[model samples]
Target: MESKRLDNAALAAGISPNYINAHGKPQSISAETKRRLLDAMHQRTATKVAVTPVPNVMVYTSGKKMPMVVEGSGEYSWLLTTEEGTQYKGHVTGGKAFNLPTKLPEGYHTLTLTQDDQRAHCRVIVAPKRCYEPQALLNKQKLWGACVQLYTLRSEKNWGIGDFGDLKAMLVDVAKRGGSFIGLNPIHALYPANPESASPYSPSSRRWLNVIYIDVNAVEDFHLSEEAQAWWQLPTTQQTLQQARDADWVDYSTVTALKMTALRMAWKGFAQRDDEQMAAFRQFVAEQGDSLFWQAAFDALHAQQVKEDEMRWGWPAWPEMYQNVDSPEVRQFCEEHRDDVDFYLWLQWLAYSQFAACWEISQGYEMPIGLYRDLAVGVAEGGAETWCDRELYCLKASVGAPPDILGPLGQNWGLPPMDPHIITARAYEPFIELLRANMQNCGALRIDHVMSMLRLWWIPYGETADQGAYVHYPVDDLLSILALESKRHRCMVIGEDLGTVPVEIVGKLRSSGVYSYKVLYFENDHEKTFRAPKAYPEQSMAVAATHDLPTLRGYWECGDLTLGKTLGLYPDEVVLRGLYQDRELAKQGLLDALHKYGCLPKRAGHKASLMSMTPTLNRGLQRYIADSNSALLGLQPEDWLDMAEPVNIPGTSYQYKNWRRKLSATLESMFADDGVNKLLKDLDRRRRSAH
Candidate 1:
């Protein structure tokens, strides 16, 4: 009976006992696994009394009805207050579900019950039924956009990596070329303290901006002070900036060090200000409040800690005294270092203001989706978010994918999954906050691994990814919050449903009005024939390639296969050889399909002319994708520039220069080419004609 109760608690709390494997067979989780997982969930220590404290997650559609079964020691009287503090009274019979006589309005409310002086309270959230979708998408207006790794662009103006100024320039060119959106790689905050930590996906905080993107010369001080003006014109600054722009790959350390010195110099002028700028900065800080304080504190603290101990890189490796975010030591540190914390906060505000300028320019372009932002699956384990609210996450376990074909050993992302029950019980405020943050200045938000919304595969510490089990979340509640936020922000939501998808996810995404991710490479049939464009779901974002996948050139060259083997991805000679032969056939299959669809050029119809990653084929394939019936057609510049190196390789963090590759053609060169210009025009024509 005790074990049964444990099982009931675990299952109800969202732990899955068994699930179907990638090989189409049932896999049962061991008791050991369950116990470890439940322990990681902190469920083992949750003392349970006979009467419940609150519903694990209280969620209902606005203006809807749900039976409230109040369990208490005796007969109970309930005081239900609307979000606005309008109160309603009700009575409940023991062991019987009761119903309210009238419908509750569409807003969050509080439910308080009293039975024999045993009081309990729960937050009731009322959310919309579906996510936000614009009239253009609903009316089937074909929209196309370019996928840009913000750091990859090079120009005469930008400091080594792309900055807000470059984004504005890029946006202008895109708008002129008839592109309605510019899809950004995640701009989530990385360690400014540790400039070498470059992966946007593994961010320090999703709530903040990467200060590295701030245009140093464009800061207010440049025009206000002579010293700042001279700093920009300095021989050393010019040389370093030019060297960054000229480099074929991004050097996060070198670039950040340069930008940091310049910004600090600029700050010398602004820090003493008593004008409108200072008031605006003050207001921004006040508006930001604790979230700002926490990010600044973590960043500032990480710097101080790392300086004190060279071996320390994250909070996990820090001294125990400073580990707890709300510890007296942390409070003391923040209290003592007012100027230092403000400096970091000032950098954040400056970066955001620069980004806001770009966003405003994008809006001026009247693009359907001005700027589309990518939302990462989660933050790093030792990042500000996890530190801010330990209760919201399960730090003992890591989120990952189960063993599949791509990764025979399975994949561990090293991100901690949120405590399913705890987050829900807290009314999903964390989830809501994240949505609001990412949606800011973005006309559309791409949710990385949207499969995580319904469920996540959590591998307990010291366990293989294959040993992980699926943990269900309150999907309805999450989706409701997502929809409410999407609707509130007027931003379209796209779900990148790539791996280990829950069976109901596609349906759920559609019903929630979230667009699907349709990749040309992954949309092929079981036998490896590419699905025609029209066959794609109308409500989707069709992309030729994703950051995780190889660009057209890399895939065609099959460099990924060679690179994968070199990186120890494949072992069995037979298996590796099989994959190689399959890629060759897939290429031909794609070529044949393009020809069949009339998307290819006239001369390409001949059987003698085979598939190749030539400029001609690139144009043909890109035009083919643009002709997709899906509302948005995403084009990657790396593909157009004929770059072979992928921007990222999943399942390998330290093994590869995953996110450092630059575009073969710089912004000025790419936009100047007649061929590239013609291609963009043709893509625009195809999309416009399709609509």
Candidate 2:
């Protein structure tokens, strides 16, 4: 009885009950695991005696559905209210299938059933059958761009981290240099208060911009404001600001502190006297609405608690009453502390404007895809998103992957996966909001872990990462929505379809006009000899390397092997030795391929000839990927500088200095150098060729 009840609840919740494991064998979910998953879903007590008309969400892409099962047989009146506030009335009998009106339009609607003077309401979603795909891709324009970890960018004017001003400057430089777009690592909000938690992928909120990335000077009225004058003249502020800019790596904690004092002072300068100048920010707040309040409230509350006790992490660690955003005490707190509350809100508006200015600059560049933004798979467990709408997430289970080629023990991205049914029942308002927010001011949106559209591996809390179950998602619906947003934003969609992939999702992505993320290092057979560039698929973005992998120079010199050994990433002695041998062979194979493309000089493959990276081969590799049939090519500055290290190594956080590495050279030398600039133009020429 317990097992059956659990199964029913899970199915209703859209959690998959069985899946093929890493070893490729089908396995049933452990009975105990289902109970635990249900507990996380807050449906542990949900019984098969289910009294509701339907589970949570009743989705219909057709904008209609056959009558659904209501309780016992009885006559009932129904009303359907759509997102645009249109109401349609109807009558139906209980315990019977009732047809919805066709042509009600594609949107979320609230369905109400009135019987025996008791009414139950369910959210009804009517989405178009397919996602939005822009018409520009049909032209088959081969675009090229430079991808960068924005925070890692080294510039004289930045506050130890890259900001909107830096991005705007680079966009102009890249466009003039013939590049079309600038691909950014996720700029999603991270805690300005808690900067040590520094993975862009592990963000506080995907819906909001990171305030730290807002340029103080670039913000409206910053330099003109009295507070700004007082700030630059202050000896201490100026000293710290200079130190932050000089730091070799991003000091998030230091950077966050500096921005706060100046930002808040600037905010105070905005009185009733500043209303005319603050019109745009006010407009942004009005458009954003409640989401801004919910997020800003979380930030204010979190910051307050942190001030009381510095050890406090996120909402989970907050005082009992403050933890719930909807609580009277929390609401009362927001009212009493309006000034502090508005400060966070004001910071968000500043970020939005600063980022907007960058994209506005990008707009005029006339680059088909000016700025490509990354969208992370999920938010941190105790993040603002979950705090704002607690029901949307299953905090007890983490999103992860089963052991695969990328990770031996599987990968657990300590983020809480949303309750699929709960979110769907809300008509995917949360998901739609995320898509539109990310799509804003961008030419492309790169979805990390694109497989999550089909299914997400859920690791039950307190269990090993490897022990997890794959919960299904509404892919057809998700794809349709993604396409819709893509077309609406005029943004190309690039699915980071790396690691283990589902074959079915790949085709759907291709057919839907989403570009594939193809990495050169992975484009090889067992012999490590790369496939010909002409053999690569045309509708894809070709990358020389990913942020997770070793840099080009790092890979060429087998730095990964050496570093992996130091980091204990390799398991057995035999595996380590095999990797060393394999690296040597791969290097030789790559050298041969480079020569084939005339990117490198002809060299005989003697024993040690292929050990290190050279200027010729480095540029050769860039040209090699440039020659691929892939429609887009991405270049990283680290490779341009021939830096030999990786920015992020997966499977471990804090075990290594992840996300802190900075570019070796300053922006002027890095972007202005003839050697690299010349190579970029060559890349432009190669990518623009008629393939």
Candidate 3:
């Protein structure tokens, strides 16, 4: 019997020809016919290709310009010569154009494609890349900043949630304390009707600001009327000094509810009498475009919920007629609910306007790489971003991590992952848009779980996290986009590279100019002892503890580990005992090592003994032990105090005090305390000493 020859199409479709099996024969064709057939196949594939091309390729030259050359036959390849006549190669592959090793002399230069290459030249500019130069203000130098959820920052004015006014005041305090930058947690839009649905990471839309942050008194219309003063007279509006002083967690739902009510009342007054303000609001809406769409959607949704007095069903679960975001039925609903939508838009304009002012006021700080925006791996399955971009999200799969030191049983975040295929097909505009929005006001972006850029562990719907498989992504394409955005925005990039990371991924990120994240608690020496502060990497951002870890004080206290154990996160006594024994042995070894290095005076006590040694003297120690390797060091607010509990635990919900805890001291009190200021000064001194 003879084997049948399969054409590409037949092979692709997995279809076998009947002629060979039935007749015991094979099909053959002339070489000329095969060549013609292959040409047809290539044309069909190439002509059918629909890819969004990246616009603007830039080539810079100083006094010396090199000649460029075109190499290939496709639509992308071209060659060129510099003014001084040196040749360089260029090509466009996979919808992106690149210049290879063009020699140019120093200063700024511009590159433009010839008339025949106009499309390639569109939006392309060749100039010096923008660099974020740290500014000095009031004799204080700026440093990179990290965002803290406002509600997480306890203040006197916060009834139960952090307010924009508090943020304003916080900025002033930060400036006064000689700090340059202050990062705030995402204030993105959320479901107003469902207060319990609040999570900064699970936003209704990445485009709009959460109205919950609005400073009611700051509204221009409110400031112009007597109603403004009266609005503050509401029982909930009155500032309680004691309430502010109490280091209590913020209740976002309650705060948003109260704030929305106040905003609605203010809106009514503005609509009736503040025409000038209304015009300004209209202009703001016009300027913001699709970014303001979520605010309107939330408002419309909120109004309907108020009328129905229940959670609005997810749009997919809604009647088919109302499923589309831009459907006629939805349009009618929005029209009927114009006032509500307008109010929501008004609230966003106010928040962003004020935020912009705040950003400008605190400009001297080093905007750490890309304002290190933490992109939550997924959105709430029914959230607005999902509803608006449903095709991009995989509602059937949830993003999670395998069981690790933190979660023995693994963890499921309950957020949906994006459909990688869909994202790639769409040229990644949705992801890019989200990145652009987050990076608009940030100097650096910290992609949480940066390893996800390489591959993600996606748990199928209804499956345990442990059962999930790793899904690959176009990491090179994604990182290139990131690098392009970073270059465009003059922002740096940082990756949260903790946990099980492949060695190669870190090198790739570093090559792309993204810094790695290093946490003090995670760095261990060869012997497994906690690496000393001096051992941290200089190129990385070093934090004493992250939001997910126990506070520095809490770690020393040790008793707080019970909280994690109770939450079923930590191991039982057997594992705990083993870890404890290992820690003790490690401590003893460290002491012996220190003694051998002559770091101690032989009679020094615990604190003094550790403090006396210089990082450089330890030859066998890591860079973190020497503290001379990293650029910036971070100190958690809880670390400065003796708190033990971590702000968040990985797996358990409700059982852990995650995203709901206040600092031991109020911001004002913390600033006033000699101990806090001394610690700050000491930390500052240590940082400067290395320089």
Candidate 4:
């Protein structure tokens, strides 16, 4: 009896009681799991529905029609308002469901209905049929580009970590070599106070750029200030900067300290100036409005808290009064620290300007897709996004994937999941704004773990991923909005459909004009034979590997497995043994495929066991994927440099120093290498020749 009640509640809450596992077998949620999830989802105390008859929001696709149902017996008068303030009025008899006289244009609109003593309103969103695609892509042109973790880039001029300056250099090099775009890692804002929290996947706010990526030297105020110039010439400052630049892994805290100190001095200098630059800065802040205000406020508050107590990593650790962003205590803090807030706001503008400069460079070179940026799936639970709108996020649960063959215990990313009901009720304003923010300053945007647009695996707090259930989302409506935003921004879209994707969303994602992600490492069948390059989908972006996986050299040497074992990722010796066996077969298959495709040079070993990752084999693996039929290809700079370390590893957070690995070579040396240039030229030729 209890089980049946739990099942009903689960279904009511949009949780899948039973779902197909990765192995294609149905798995049922236990009663205990269902109850726990229900507690987190607020199903036990579900709120009562409003007495109003109309829904809070309705989303529709342009040219398609949906009936507007009004629950009443009397005649009703209605008025429709488009985003432009244009209105259309009509009346319905018998309060019956009816279609509007004319189709709504693609934008947000409002509908008002009135009857005797009854009034109801709804926010309606109309979207385009499909997302935007570049004219070159529409003409069936295939393109290739370099994919780099922005932080991994090294240049002669950058202070310590890779900045927009490095990005501009890389962009110029790639564009000069006939590459169409430069794909970047997620550059979302992280904790400036706690720079050790370096994972880009868990960000403070997706709406703002990571100010640490801002090129300090590129800022006009830096050059304008004598104080800034004096600080830059200091021996201690120069020593630390050189140490950070020479380090194998990024020293986040050190780099953050240097950049923030320099920026603070520059901000002080700018405060005395009243120029057109200051006017432009104010305009940016005005346009960003509340979202920018909250972000800056949070950073200011966090910095003060961390200054007093270094142990305080995020808002959750703050005093209760300040934990609530709307609290009187927080308002007082923001008021008293107004200059601090403005400083952070100024930092964002700087980040935006430098990134926009990079985008402008891409345009000047006439690249088809200048820059494609990545959007992380979700924000950290204790970040600015959740603190500002607590009601929009379900803080009691985290989103992750279910148990699969690779991970028997499943996985839980320490990030909060946004409540779909609240999102839909708000007319997807948050989601729309997120897309817009990331879509800006780029020609294409990649949605990490794009499956979340359809459904996300929601695990209750303090529960393992295996105890989680899949919560469905409004996929069609979200896609419609995505299409609309894509058209408005004139930016293309790519979905990272690399996991246990359900059969249902496959056709939908493909039909929505969103490019599919095709990783060459996973392009194989049950027999371990790699798929032919020609077999990759035409509407896809193909790559050798992703940030979460090992680089080409690392994978060839079984470095990831060795690292995982040391980190206690393997369940047992048997699991490790099985993984090794699979890897051996996969290696042989890759070599066989490369030889079959005529990508392998005669000097490269025919047997997988006899091979080490040399330039011959490295370029061979790259050339194999570059010859794919996909519309776009992304080659990693790490692979070209034959670096063995990966930028990030999945499943472990603090256990591994993830997101700190730097490229083996600097951008200056990389572009100067004749071998690297030859490989890129070949990639461009192959992509052009691809059918």
Candidate 5:
């Protein structure tokens, strides 16, 4: 019998021919074909393999015994045993696994899969169970946060880029000012060799911190030396360095190169320090494990190759024998390059140590959600995460947004999407691991374009964003995982739900305890008039503007309009201001209506209308007063500095200021700025008076 192609029949059935072929001729279809077809469908269709819900199981552990559980079904039984090796029975029954003893040893232990007598799956830590409810932490107090791009913030001592020490200063300032949180741009690793490819949104790896932010002066070993102090005071050398640091904007490539060199030099000095510091460095290296070592090795190799030939530095274009990270050849390369690897690791240790201190300082607040970290949608194709997990990421497809008002041509983010089929087959372990890594020290996470969890615009290789199609995701399972992790971590979840969102999806996310982001500029009446603060959603994290849009000052001052015209984001200032006027008038009218309705005071209502006329007027005042209706408010650091340009422009990448511009004001100046300080005081007053 001839094998049916199923192309016509499958089209009639509203299914792909490949999908039909998989189901109807499973045995005849080659396994490779099956895998490819499955992966394609998983990326393109709404079809999904059913997921058996795993009940949130609680296990108790004492000083002595081991706990065990079984997962999966059929002939593939995975016996999950603790590291302590105490025997416990488990089996899949009634569509779920049930285990005996229901506990584990008090000390940390690895929960591994043992198939028959051999280990079949990866291990996860089983820490001693806690009696304290994670939710209790949430009940402590409410938090308000502001987002800052560290590299974009201005500082006197910074070596051409904002440092972790700068971030620490910002955190302390926010804490003293009565704010509870400080959100930051994605601090994930980026392509070190190509510093100009410095989009925090397109990271190399979510697992590693960006070493560019490490403060060389803050390193304990460096600060202890009189020689280091003298080096810092060299007028001729310091003059050139200070000029670089005081430049209007950060030159990321130059900054990273210089910082890395300084960091390496500092590390060399540290190695010669007291035995205690050396021992501490050794212990840090051990705790970071192999992942850090691998990243360091790759960086070292990348730096070396770039120095040799800048054009051919990426791992994909590296010598074929050294391409595969797991190959024995690569291991041999690592052994040969051990010193370089240690240099990279030492830099990472310093970065992590500085970040940890900053996090600790923030955690001291009574209602602190230490930091609200941003998680970018995807990783760079030639970056660390993709190189490390090549099989897990779909290098052929890019993640992007569908055509909308802001981006009429649509948006190809130039980030490779993950292979959903592979992710599912691996039981979402890859995503879970990324999530764990991101959520490690943060108390809140802002999942950029949270809608990606439901569906994603997938642009295939060699295709434009307009030619892309929407692909469905397992939203139910994805959200469940997010909820589970958020609950476990006692963290607040904020979904960036801007752009064209299905109305029902907002309700769904809200019901799932995820807070939807609401921009003050976008919340409006049906006629395109901006709504007053009284009309804002109480559950949202209300903000004056986002990094992708104009800062509040920029919007009101016509600075954004001017820049938009200069950058050709808009054709002319006339049209740009017209749009702003239309929006502002609508917003003013809304405030007038609020005043009439007694939602706002009559004097304050008119003052609010007047404040909107000036570009430099702090918009946080509106959000603060409106906090009676909204739960939290976020301020952009750029807005505090009255920066003229937005952090990101939607359509054009290179032409727009986008991600390159840094604020002109110092961190201390921003904190002490009369406009910003007044707004903070007003917010504090509103919160107190409201209660």
Candidate 6:
């Protein structure tokens, strides 16, 4: 009876009693886990609350009948106010159904209800039925692009890390070879103060671009400032840059220090400006508003904290008074550090303009999808986003994945999950703003772990990932808003619907016009037989592997498995043995599939055990995916270079240096190579032939 009550309570809290694992088997949540999650969720039963005339938020498809219930002793006066300031007035009787206007148009509007003197407001969001689809895709045209880890990109001009200028050069290089876009790693802002915290996926703020990607040389003030010019010519500065550029792995600290100094010198030059550019900067600042202000303030304050105590990583580690954004101490800190805050804001402006310049290049090239930007699933718990709005996010629980074949112990990302109840109560202002922020200046937006639109795996504070339960999200309303935003921004949406996708959301995602993400490694059956390239869905983006997966060359050689074993990822020798055996079998199956599809040349060896990963086999694997039925293809540069090292290793945080690895070759050298050039040309041809 106690267990039944707890399960019922968990269900009421939107916690799933059981979830289907990656293996398609249902896994039940423990009673203790449910109790813990419930305690963390802190769901409250309504107390003496009269039936709300309407929900706090109501989402409707334009031209559809929107029904409402107004419960009370008497009639209630209703005022429907459209976003454009148009008003429609009507009276709704108590205990009777109210039908709103069918064609209320697409926008976030206001609905006011009055019973006597008591008043309530509801945010009415009317959205389109589907997301935006480019004309090229509508015309049944297939396109290919290079998927890149932005910071890993190397070039002669970069200051250790790849910057906006390098991105522009890549755009030009790709456009010349018939590529439609540049699919980038998440460029969301990270800690400028703690440059070593460099996982792009775990960002400080998803709404803002990482200022480190700003090209110091491209800043107009850099050339204008004599101090910046002098700093650039210094022997020490040049030596640091050379060391960073020549390093095997990205030295983020050295790069950040160099760029920040150059940028500060440039900021000194910019402070003297009263030209049209200054006016434009002011307009951008105004447009960004308080959200941008808080980020700047956070960055400025974080730097000071780090200076005082080098161990300070985020706001949570600061003095108690400075922890809250609304605290008086925080206000004083922002005031005292006014110049510092403005400098950070200026850095954001520079990043935005340089990124816009790259977008302009894509437009000039007339690419179908110019710059495909990624939107991370969540922000770090102690980051700016969480610091700014404590009420919106549930700090009592963290988001993570359950135990799967890849991660036997399950995975905890140390990121907080937002409260669904509060999100609806606030009328999804946070969600709307987040989508708008990421969609800007990009042709397509890739939503990381798009399952987040439906639900998230929520683990209570101080609990293991395996002790978590799935919490449901407002999917219909969220998807409606997503489609609305996608259409408004003219940016197509690609749902990173990888991992254990629920059966319910699959069709909804497909019907909503959001493109699916299909990784070649995961597109296999129980027998480990790879799916045919032609069997890929039309509304999908196919790639050979993701950042978490091994490169084609690395996969062939079992390099990732070897590395994982060394990192102590497996439970025992038996698990490791099974993994190696499966890998060998998978490789054989892959070779067979390649041969069957004629992806491999006639002279290529038929036996996987006899074959090694040469340029021929690597290029063949690329060709296999390039000829997929998916509308878009994203090839990795690491695979093109036949690099063995993986960019990242999932499930381990401190055990591995994730996200710091650089591409084996510079973009300049790779593009100049005849083999690379022919491979790209061949990929373009294959994509064009996709049908």
Best candidate (score: lDDT): 6
Positional deviation of residue 477's Cα in model 4 after best superposition, in angstroms: 0.6
Model 1 lDDT tens row, 1-691? 3567767766876888887776867888766667778888844354566657446447777666766666644667888888777889977766777664357765577888776767788787777888888778878799898989999887777778888888999999999999998999999888877877788878878889988899876787856777766877789878877777778889887898787777776777889999999999999999888998888888888878878886677788899988897789988998998777888889999988988888899889888788999999998988888778777788889998887655667878889888877766567878888898999887899999898878898998868888898998878778888888898888989998875565667788889989988888877877878898788889899998888888898898888888988998787889999988888777777888888887876876444125457887888788778888889999999877888898888768687887788888778989999988988999999999887
What lDDT score belongs to each candidate, Candidate 1 first? 0.82, 0.80, 0.56, 0.87, 0.65, 0.88
The TM-score values for the models, in the order shown, are: 0.93, 0.89, 0.74, 0.96, 0.79, 0.96
Give the alpha carbon lDDT tens digit for every residue of 211-276 in model 2.
888888775556767867887788987898888778777888889888787777777776444566
TM-score for candidate 1? 0.93
Off by over 4 Å in 4: 1-3, 21-25, 42-50, 116-118, 566-571, 602-604
Question: How many clashes show up in model 1?
Answer: 0
lDDT of 2 at 242: 86
- Candidate 4 steric clashes: 0
Clashes of 2: 9
Candidate 6 regions exceeding 4 Å error are 1-7, 20-32, 42-45, 404-408, 567-571
Each prediction's RMSD to truth = 2.7, 3.5, 10.1, 2.1, 7.3, 2.0
Residue 596 deviation, candidate 2, in Å? 3.1
Answer with 1 or 2, whichever has the higher TM-score.
Answer: 1
| Winner by lDDT between candidate 6 and candidate 4 | 6
Candidate 2 has what TM-score?
Answer: 0.89
Q: Which whole-number lDDT from 0 to 100 does residue 417 have in model 3?
A: 71
What does candidate 5's lDDT look like per residue over 508-564, in tens digits? 787777777877667766675555555666566777677777776666656666666
Q: What is the RMSD, in Å, between candidate 1 and the native fold over all Cα?
A: 2.7
Please identify model 1 stretches exceeding 4 Å from their true place. Answer: 1-9, 44-57, 73-105, 112-120, 223-230, 565-572, 605-609
